[PDB]
Amino acid sequence: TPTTFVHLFEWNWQDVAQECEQYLGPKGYAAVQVSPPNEHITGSQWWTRYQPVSYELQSRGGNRAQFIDMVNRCSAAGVDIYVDTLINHMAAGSGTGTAGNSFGNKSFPIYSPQDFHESCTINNSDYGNDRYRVQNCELVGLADLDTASNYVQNTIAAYINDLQAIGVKGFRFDASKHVAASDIQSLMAKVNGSPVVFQEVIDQGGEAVGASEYLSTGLVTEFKYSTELGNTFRNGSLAWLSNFGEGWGFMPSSSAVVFVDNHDNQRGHGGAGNVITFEDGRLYDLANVFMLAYPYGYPKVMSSYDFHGDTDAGGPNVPVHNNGNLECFASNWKCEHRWSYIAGGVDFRNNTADNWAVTNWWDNTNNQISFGRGSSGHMAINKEDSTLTATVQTDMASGQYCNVLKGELSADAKSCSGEVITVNSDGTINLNIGAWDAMAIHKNAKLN
Ligand SMILES: [Ca+2]
Ligand SMILES: [Cl-]
Numbered sequence: 001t002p003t004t005f006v007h008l009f010e011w012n013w014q015d016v017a018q019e020c021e022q023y024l025g026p027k028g029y030a031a032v033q034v035s036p037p038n039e040h041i042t043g044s045q046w047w048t049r050y051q052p053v054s055y056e057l058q059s060r061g062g063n064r065a066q067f068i069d070m071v072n073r074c075s076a077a078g079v080d081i082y083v084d085t086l087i088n089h090m091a092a093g094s095g096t097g098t099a100g101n102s103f104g105n106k107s108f109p110i111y112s113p114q115d116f117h118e119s120c121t122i123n124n125s126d127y128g129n130d131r132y133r134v135q136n137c138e139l140v141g142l143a144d145l146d147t148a149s150n151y152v153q154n155t156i157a158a159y160i161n162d163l164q165a166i167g168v169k170g171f172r173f174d175a176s177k178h179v180a181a182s183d184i185q186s187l188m189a190k191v192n193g194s195p196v197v198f199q200e201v202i203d204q205g206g207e208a209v210g211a212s213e214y215l216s217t218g219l220v221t222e223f224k225y226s227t228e229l230g231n232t233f234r235n236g237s238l239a240w241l242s243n244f245g246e247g248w249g250f251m252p253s254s255s256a257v258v259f260v261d262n263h264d265n266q267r268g269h270g271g272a273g274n275v276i277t278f279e280d281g282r283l284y285d286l287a288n289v290f291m292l293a294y295p296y297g298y299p300k301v302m303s304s305y306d307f308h309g310d311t312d313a314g315g316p317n318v319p320v321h322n323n324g325n326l327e328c329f330a331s332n333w334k335c336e337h338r339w340s341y342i343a344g345g346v347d348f349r350n351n352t353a354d355n356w357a358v359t360n361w362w363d364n365t366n367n368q369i370s371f372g373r374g375s376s377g378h379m380a381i382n383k384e385d386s387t388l389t390a391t392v393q394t395d396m397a398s399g400q401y402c403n404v405l406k407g408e409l410s411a412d413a414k415s416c417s418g419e420v421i422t423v424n425s426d427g428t429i430n431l432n433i434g435a436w437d438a439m440a441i442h443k444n445a446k447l448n
Contacts, residue, residue, distance in 0.1 A: 001353040002030035004292065004346045005082065006301045006337045009263050010035055010046060010315035013062035017073040018321045025077030027343055028350045031196075032074065033082045033172055033300060035060070037067050038159070039099040041091050044314040046263075050174065051142065052086050053097030054109045055159040060098065060314075071167040082170035082196065083163055087156055087187070088178045089142035090116075106143050115152055117144045122178075131208040135180050147183040157190035170196035173218070177201045181213040188217055198257045198298075202270045215255050222256040222297060224249070226265060230274045233287050238383055239363035245296040258297035260287045266304065267311040278304055278334045282436050285341035286381055289405060289438050292345030293371075293379045295356040301346065303337045306330075344405035344440060351442040352377040362392050370431070372396070377442035378423075382433040391430050398425045401441035413448040420447070 006029050008016055016032060024032065036049040039056045049060065057064040071081050090111060091097075094104030106113040120137035127134055138144050145152050160171060176184065176199035184199070197218035203211035204224055214220050228248060232240055245253055265271030266278075276287045291299055305315045308331075316332035328335035336342055355374035363369045368388045370380035375395040382388035400420050402409050407418020421441050423429055433439055 001350055002028065003349045003353050004029060004299050004301060005031040005033060005080075006303055007033040007259075007263065008035075008303050008337075010049075010305060011061070011303070011320065011333075013066040013070040015320040016061075017070040020070075020074035020077040020079045023338065024074075024079050028346060029079060029301075029337065031080035031082050031170060033084060034070075036084045036086060036174075037061055038086070039097040039101060041095050041097060045312045046314050047312070048314075049084075050086065051091035052089070053091055053095075053101050053103050054099065055155075055162075056099045056101075058099035068166055075167055080169040080196075081167065082172055082198075083168050084172045084174055085156075085160065086174050087145075087147065087184070088175035089139060089144055092138075092141040092143060110155060111145070111152075115146055115149060117146050119144075127207055127209075129208055134209055135178055139175060139178055144178070147179050147187070153183075153187050153190055157187060160195075161192050164192055164195060168195070170198070173197060173199045175200060176214055176220075177203070177207075177209050181217065184214070184217045211251060215251070219255055219257050219298060220251060221262075222250050222258050223265075223270060225256070225258040225297065226261060226275060227271060229260060229287060229291065230271075230276045233276060233283065233290075233383075234274055237366045238290075238369045238381060239365050239367070241290070241294075241369065242358075242361050242363065244294060250296070253296045256297035257300060258291065259300050259302060260284065260291055261302050262300075263302070263304070266302065267307075278302075278306075278336055284336070285339065286383060286436065286438060288336075288339075288342045289345045289379070289381060289440065292342075292349045293352075293373075293377075293440060295358060295373070299349075301337045301342055304334045305332060306334060340407075341405045341438070344408075347404050347408075347445075348377055348379065348440045348442050351444045359395060360393050362390070364388075364390070373442075375443065377440065378429065379438065379440040380431055380433060381438040383436060385435050387435070388431050388433040391428050394423060394427050394429055396423045396427060396441070396443070397446070398423050398427070400447040402445045402447070403439045403441060404445050405438055405440050409445045409447070413446070416445075416447065 039054040041048045041051045057067050101109050117136045122137040199214045201211045202223045261277045265275050307313045352373035355376045359372040361371045367383035370392045372378040378394045402416030403419045407416050
């Protein structure tokens with residue numbers, strides 16, 4: 001059963017379509033969050049995607065036909081498409097867009113200067129004491145749309161409904177904190193049906209505008225998750241994670257979208273150095289295994305490119321599927337969604353979705369933990385310097401199981417491609433996990 005989505009950051013439509021068919025579908029990912037498909041400013045930086053010019057489907061990712069082709073091919077493969085939608089602003093300054101349209105002085109093909117709030121700057125101190133400025137002033141110079149206007153609402157709603165008509169199943173509302181929750185409620189009343197909607201709201205406490213204000217209009221990004229998980233894995237004890245979630249003051253599990261890192265915080269926007277990313281290698285593997293095994297929120301796996309320390313740089317100059325070879329794992333696309341520990345975690349989550357309880361939690365008071373998901377699965381992480389050899393209790397049927405983080409069950413269920421884990425007649429497992437390693441087993445990866 002589908003439980004996890006992935007952000008194919010800066011991936012073009014051709015690459016996404018092929019990825020859906022060859023990997024995402026077969027591996028069980030539920031959906032793909034794509035980069036903004038609408039017309040945006042010209043330029044090679046990744047952030048040009050966040051400065052809209054119009055709603056025509058011609059962007060760095062491809063043209064309208066290629067976009068439609070991608071939705072169709074992914075849909076047939078069993079994978080949904082979530083579109084990153086810009087509901088708060090339009091591009092700053094003047095220029096030309098990716099579909100040839102010009103703009104300048106708050107004049108665009110679809111908006112006039114009167115469709116925006118009067119210009120003012122959002123200062124850092126405004127976040128803590130002035131909700132009016134946070135929602136009516138400009139985010140880093142971006143023209144702030146009058147989201148209370150019936151015209152503006154109809155225009156954004158037409159775009160969303162158009163995308164639904166061609167097959168899009170979900171939407172990410174970018175910069176939601178900068179738009180009054182009541183404006184979003186009014187916008188949603190114009191949207192057909194009930195697509196999956198998740199709102200980007202960064203709230204780590206002490207904001208004049210809180211994440212809780214957006215719970216009635218859809219799911220909300222829980223940034224406390226990314227930050228605390230990173231902080232605990234680097235500077236704390238994994239044993240503290242026994243009550244992770246609402247117990248730590250996070251929003252309701254059923255309303256949260258979580259992640260180890262996202263495209264912004266892996267670049268220092270909305271997250272400090274404690275955020276764990278692909279650069280951390282094995283540490284990133286372990287952080288993902290915890291997130292995917294733990295029953296809190298709707299997770300999304302990050303899929304990045306090596307930016308070589310340049311936080312403004314756009315993606316690689318080569319496609320992922322290049323003349324027969326995969327441009328993954330090296331200095332171009334990282335493809336974390338293909339890393340064995342991460343893909344194995346997704347498999348574990350997909351196969352334990354019938355039991356959302358954390359059962360039989362065990363820890364060594366520090367960096368060795370193990371817990372189950374009833375009789376559906378069990379896992380363990382060793383982040384100490386010595387082997388984890390403890391005997392832990394499970395609710396699983398005795399037998400042989402493939403450690404899904406390191407391999408998988410063959411078609412005839414006669415063998416695994418990686419190590420085998422044995423569940424004893426009394427439900428116990430005599431662990432044998434080396435330093436900075438883990439194991440995960442589930443009821444549907446049992447040897448015959
Ligand atoms: Ca605004
Ligand atoms: Cl996000």
